[PDB]
Prior knowledge:
This is part of a larger assembly, with chains A, B, C and D.
Chain A: E1 18-21, E2 32-35, H1 43-46, E3 51-52, E4 55-56, E5 60-61, E6 64-68, E7 82-84, E8 112-115, E9 146-148, E10 167-172
Antiparallel strand pairs in A: 1-2, 3-6, 4-5, 6-7, 8-10, 9-10
Chain B: E1 12-16, E2 19-23, E3 29-30, E4 38-41, E5 46-49, H1 61-74, E6 79-86, E7 91-95, E8 98-102, E9 109-111, E10 117-123, E11 126-131, H2 134-146, E12 157-160
Antiparallel strand pairs in B: 1-2, 2-3, 4-5, 6-11, 6-12, 7-8, 8-9, 10-11
Chain C: E1 28-32, E2 36-39, H1 43-53, E3 61-62, E4 68-70, E5 88-93, E6 98-102, H2 107-118, E7 125-127
Antiparallel strand pairs in C: 1-6, 1-7, 2-5, 3-6, 4-5
Helix pairs in contact in C: 1-2
The complex binds magnesium ion (17 copies).
One magnesium ion binds at residues 13-14 of chain C.
Chain D binds two RNA strands through α2.
PDB class: ribosome
Keywords: Deinococcus radiodurans, avilamycin, degradable antibiotics, ribosome, large ribosomal subunit, resistance
Entry title: The large ribosomal subunit from Deinococcus radiodurans in complex with avilamycin
Amino acid sequence: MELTAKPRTPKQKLDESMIAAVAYNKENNVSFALDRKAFDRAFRQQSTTGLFDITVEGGETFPALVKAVQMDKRKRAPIHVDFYMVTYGEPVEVSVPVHTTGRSQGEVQGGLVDIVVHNLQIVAPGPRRIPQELVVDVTKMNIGDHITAGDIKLPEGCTLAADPELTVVSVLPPRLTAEE
Amino acid sequence: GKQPIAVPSGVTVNAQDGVFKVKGPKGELTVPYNTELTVRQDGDQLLVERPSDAQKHRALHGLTRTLVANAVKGVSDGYTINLELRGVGFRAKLTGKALEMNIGYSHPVIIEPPAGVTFAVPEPTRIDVSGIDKQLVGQVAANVRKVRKPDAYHGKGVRFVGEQIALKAGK
Amino acid sequence: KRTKFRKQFRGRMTGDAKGGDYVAFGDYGLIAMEPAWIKSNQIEACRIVMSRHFRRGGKIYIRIFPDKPVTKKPAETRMGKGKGAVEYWVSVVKPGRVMFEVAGVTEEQAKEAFRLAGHKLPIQTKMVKREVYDEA
Amino acid sequence: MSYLIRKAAGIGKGSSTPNKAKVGKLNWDQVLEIAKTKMPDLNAGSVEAAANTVAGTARSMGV
RNA sequence: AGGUUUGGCACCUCGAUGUCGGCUCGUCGCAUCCUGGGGCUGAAGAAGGUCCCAAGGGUUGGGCUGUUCGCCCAUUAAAGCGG
RNA sequence: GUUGGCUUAGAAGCAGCCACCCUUCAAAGAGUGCGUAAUAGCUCACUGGUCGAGUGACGAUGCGCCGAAAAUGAUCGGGGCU
Lengths: 180, 171, 136, 63
Ligand SMILES: [Mg+2]
Ligand SMILES: [Mg+2]
Ligand SMILES: [Mg+2]
Ligand SMILES: [Mg+2]
Ligand SMILES: [Mg+2]
Ligand SMILES: [Mg+2]
Ligand SMILES: [Mg+2]
Ligand SMILES: [Mg+2]
Ligand SMILES: [Mg+2]
Ligand SMILES: [Mg+2]
Ligand SMILES: [Mg+2]
Ligand SMILES: [Mg+2]
Ligand SMILES: [Mg+2]
Ligand SMILES: [Mg+2]
Ligand SMILES: [Mg+2]
Ligand SMILES: [Mg+2]
Ligand SMILES: [Mg+2]
């Protein structure tokens, strides 16, 4: 959301809560120091599903989308957080989670709705309007039904990143046994 | 905790050092209270402030007031507990100020009451402990309760007034 | 559990968890805090433990798995060679590595089903949720 | 209730596992004949508040 | 956890630290066999079960075996476990 | 509705596997624990009232607590130390 100081000096960071980071449009990149507290209060609200505005000290506001984040093992808190930029209406493919709305009548049949893959990369066009979620109706499918990637609704001409036939949601059959 | 203290018109409290005493119609009862704590009469009704918000403090706040409160109701209305004997042919008598109890025990068991306390047995199986001090009266009637603790089966023994007891029913 | 044909032997060393993620294959997952070996059993009992507390449902995922063979005294002493081919199989796990993951069960549902499997495990553990999303 | 349903619908037992192995359903007629003794019983406002009231159960029984 | 088992190891001892079992003499630990105080019980009473506190004292004579052990006879409040 | 259906000597919120919708309503789960051979019987979930200002739940960390029994007489070297 906001940051003030962003030096090369490493030990000024953890004295407060701040994450060593960067941002780039390829036209330029530069030092970053970001408050950790309001960041994971922020990223929590956003992720890669959408961009948020940046205000650096010195009166420079450049809108950016979160790209990749390097997490510390043995802990929760992140140690890195890469950032990328926005050029309308081209910009880089955005990862979209699969939210599975409605209760299937095959889960009523003793099965379990399971999403094989989430955060589909897709792309395009506006990164004002980005697909922060993906709605998929499962009431149709019952048991053994594999919903593929060509069945997923993506308005405004967002081309599928992966294969059309790749399986996203598949409802898994009830637990079965026969022999002793 | 609860700050207000209702003080009757016949009681006197002088708070100096670690000595806080109440004198009234039922006689004097003197219970020592904390010095580090602030206790004094504000107007008519009593007020006990506490020095800090610290954890070890506030612990003696909720303590102190009811201790003084007990002293208030102690020198005013006094205190009494009702005891009940249950089980076959249990009984109690009175010799001097002393309670004579006989319950299911080869050699009968008796109790000499400490001063300030007085026994009353208006009915053969009904025992009343009378007294000022709310502490001593407690251990007095807890001593009487010692003699036979009501069993998990038929509930035979000494109990409090109408206190209800669950039963095991083995056979 | 114990696997098919191999190289057959090993020594030992310890770093930090490399290929364990934070999350995968479900909502909730289990993460080891201490460097250690886990055997063919343990995790085998951990599966059975977790599944027992479920509907038996096939929603459980085990990212861990025994590879490393360990050995033992045939009877005693130092007489002779190194020996003990089948004693047990172990799977080394390092801190931050995610061990098990579950699917479709609720919050307390998998909280208690991890807790039961918390015991039977030589190390302390903590379960989790997803923030970092990494698939590539 | 279903003693007045199973018999009239021609069912021996009922739904053991209603979600998986299905039993059957029935015509809307079964709402009226069970509504005669349920007037003082079923708590409702007057007139037609008892229409959708009497049988919701067959739907939840598995029949 | 302990350090009584079989071991591992090879550290003092091969110009010598006598090895099993018994008998005699004791003493110590408590993870208590009895006795003393307790909680729970699928504890009605009686008789028990399990856990807790407790080391003051006590803990039988015999048959077979070199045996320790163990099995048996007749007892006992009990016929404790180790150092 | 009501003892929801299945099963059992019966199982009616609560042996138990399947499910967990509807009616009334300021509101009450085919239901959490106790209970019975089975319903009853007693509190919770939730609503209304009475009273006052906070109160409840997960993790992180500093320093502590229990877990903590072995053999001649004990102890941090000792005295002693908040
Ligand atoms: Mg190493
Ligand atoms: Mg990798
Ligand atoms: Mg040895
Ligand atoms: Mg050597
Ligand atoms: Mg010599
Ligand atoms: Mg010599
Ligand atoms: Mg002891
Ligand atoms: Mg005893
Ligand atoms: Mg109990
Ligand atoms: Mg007895
Ligand atoms: Mg024991
Ligand atoms: Mg001895
Ligand atoms: Mg029952
Ligand atoms: Mg059973
Ligand atoms: Mg259920
Ligand atoms: Mg009832
Ligand atoms: Mg009430």
